[model samples]
Target: TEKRGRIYLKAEVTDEKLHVTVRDAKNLIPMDPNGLSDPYVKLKLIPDPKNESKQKTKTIRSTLNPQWNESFTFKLKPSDKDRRLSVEIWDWDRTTRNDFMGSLSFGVSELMKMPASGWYKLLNQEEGEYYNVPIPE
Candidate 1:
């Protein structure tokens, strides 16, 4: 399917950590011509003008619908609440570069704005409003 689906995230904040659950993704576009993709997700806590490192989920082989159900934690300072969470879904390749399928980002503050724990939509990087910030490579 050409249509893309959203990534479901359960985000939580505490005095010491920002815990993120990567639940699953649906309706992803297959980067391979054969209509299959080996997919994985990349999560980065946007702590820049300084750090640019990101954490990754293991690749799920040849499936358009992927279930990660994986959790990642970051040392959270109170000030980090304003930072953005950068998420990218990619098609993994062993022989060449992985293909960038789609991406979305949201501020930690935005997640906090929710009344409680819920699924939030992943905004496409191109559609992202915060464009001036440089993403560390």
Candidate 2:
């Protein structure tokens, strides 16, 4: 069995580039303890007109620390003016993206943290947290 924590993204949109930074709340362990620090990062552009979904990804190579403040940058053409980004972090354990441990998302225009975007322990199952927003048509 695998346990995962929350991951978050800091995304900023500008006239030239889409800058992204990934932050992890908890340390994600690789499947193989023998090779524990062999994890990497992947960025997925969400499948929305507001996002470019098929650009593929890059790798962080390696890390020895638990928490990450890793940053990644993507060059944006005029065509990518209105797309959202989704990011996933994984401890590949010498495997593929399937070894994912956590993920996060952000809008293209600003660096906003989503609700509960960090590690949380659900102590009260009967209770929940809500953010009120006007319903979109």
Candidate 3:
């Protein structure tokens, strides 16, 4: 079976900016010696290789189910409807690098709707970007 991890978030567009609130994550991939993780949620906007749109939630210690009422906003344009919103969950460690736990992605246009909130399944990689690259005609 696939990794049984899910992250909850709410995304919407208001006043021309995209607002994303990370609600929580459940059943995350455990990464600590004691069998739980100090989890955090990281945000990314595709086409942002420069990391201008990168943001993250505060780490919630020792729980597969972590909650953070953290909210972040991003700048967007009409053309950005074809872009993507990506989410990554990490296990924060005091020593050594943080470990990747899960990831998912959504469409800028898809999540731009009135009700863009829910639980997303976490995976080895982002559900993939939502750019919908041009296909052969």
Candidate 4:
């Protein structure tokens, strides 16, 4: 079976900026000598009240050879409060015939951050951010 772990995002919104760190559940792999592949990491910010296919927040790429402590500073507008934070990490699996292996997590940054724990419960909470559905008309 493939190894897996929890994805964690700690974001704090002050009056001026949105500070974020996007990390996955998997332990950091020391190195990938193969050079044949490196993992793909994406942070899609899905706007609330909109369809998923059309919404994307921020996307970034990372490597298997190093730990990802990626930091992002977003200049927020008054309107960004209700947007959904969708984090997706993908690894191209050789065993799966190069099919993409993927993990997903999501939350509403504004509503989620309002809580004292600020979405930390999402890590241990049942089901967590794994729930997703296409927005319906």
Candidate 5:
């Protein structure tokens, strides 16, 4: 069994592009013997037949909590009615394949209302919860 992590995110869909920022994360589970995890964030637009429109944050080293003020821009057409954005938190294991920590996904239209999205409780995709309003920090 593994532990789940929480992620802080901010995203907006402008004219024809999706602007996203992976602010930081907290309480992640370590996947190495070093007692910490080197984590990164992955973003992808769903139903991507060509599998295009993806971006990632750089790995933050040796911490259970990491800050990744990484922002990514995807300039593409009409975030369309069906476009969804998915985020995955993963451990970068230099000694092995990366480990999936947790993830969350939601529609672009929903993220459109976000000024600064709140802390999401990361879990499996099927169980991932996307609450649109930001909670008081």
Candidate 6:
């Protein structure tokens, strides 16, 4: 995974439900050489992988920065501790296979311990920046 962009999100958990809002993405690397891509985001929960109903946002056409004010909610259980939320950003092409630009994941417990809503820095496997701020080690 490479650090390619930043995504804005707001998350909260209440009454055994996990709520997430995908607000927007920006400064993405255009998969197309002409600086164009139809981008969308896919989100899933890991460890307890039985939920195949992954949530995704509508594709935004030909732009490096896309605003997707989309929100999703997931059922949670006590066993969900240490599980993670997986998020991937893709470039959709009508004539070719979709291109994966970048991805990041967050520990379910981390979100549970944080503020009810705020921006999160998307990170790579190697640990990187979210905008200019370094991800806490």
* Residue 5 CA displacement from its true place in model 4, Å: 2.3
lDDT for each residue of candidate 6 in 1-137, tens digit (9 for 90 to 100):
55587777776777778888988877888788678889998877775457774889999998988999999998987777957777778898888899786666666777788633444455553342111232333
Q: Which parts of model 2 have CA positions greater than 4 angstroms off?
A: 1-3, 27-30, 33-38, 48-65, 95-98, 109-137
Give, for candidate 4, the lowest lDDT window spanning 10 residues.
Answer: 116-125
Model number with the top TM-score? 3
On a 0 to 1 TM-score scale, where does candidate 2 land against the true structure? 0.50
Q: Distance from true position, residue 127, model 1, in Å?
A: 2.5
> What TM-score should be assigned to candidate 1?
0.78
Q: Which candidate wins on lDDT?
A: 3
lDDT of 5 by residue, 85-124 (tens): 8788888988899988878777776666654466866776
What RMSD, rounded to one decimal, does every model reach? 6.2, 8.5, 5.8, 8.9, 2.7, 3.9
lDDT by candidate, in order shown? 0.70, 0.46, 0.77, 0.43, 0.76, 0.73
Which residue pairs clash in candidate 3?
none
By TM-score: ranked, best first: 3, 5, 6, 1, 2, 4
Q: Give the per-residue lDDT digits (tens) of candidate 2, residues 1-137.
A: 23443334455655567766655444455445554544455565544445544333344445434555776677765544344555555554455444655444445543323222234321111121111111122
Candidate 1, 10-96: lDDT as tens digits: 667666666888888877877786798888998877766655558889999988889989988877667766787777788999888
Candidate 4, 1-137: lDDT as tens digits? 22333344566667656566754334433223453234545554544345432222232234443245576655656566555455544554545543233443444454345521222221211232354322222
**TM-scores of the candidates in the order shown:** 0.78, 0.50, 0.84, 0.48, 0.83, 0.80
> In candidate 6, how many clashes are counted?
0
- Candidate 3's error at 48, in angstroms? 0.9
lDDT of 6: 0.73
Error of 6 at 1 (Å): 6.4
Whichever of 2 and 5 has more lDDT, that candidate is 5
Misplaced by over 4 Å in model 5 are: 1-3, 113-116, 129-137
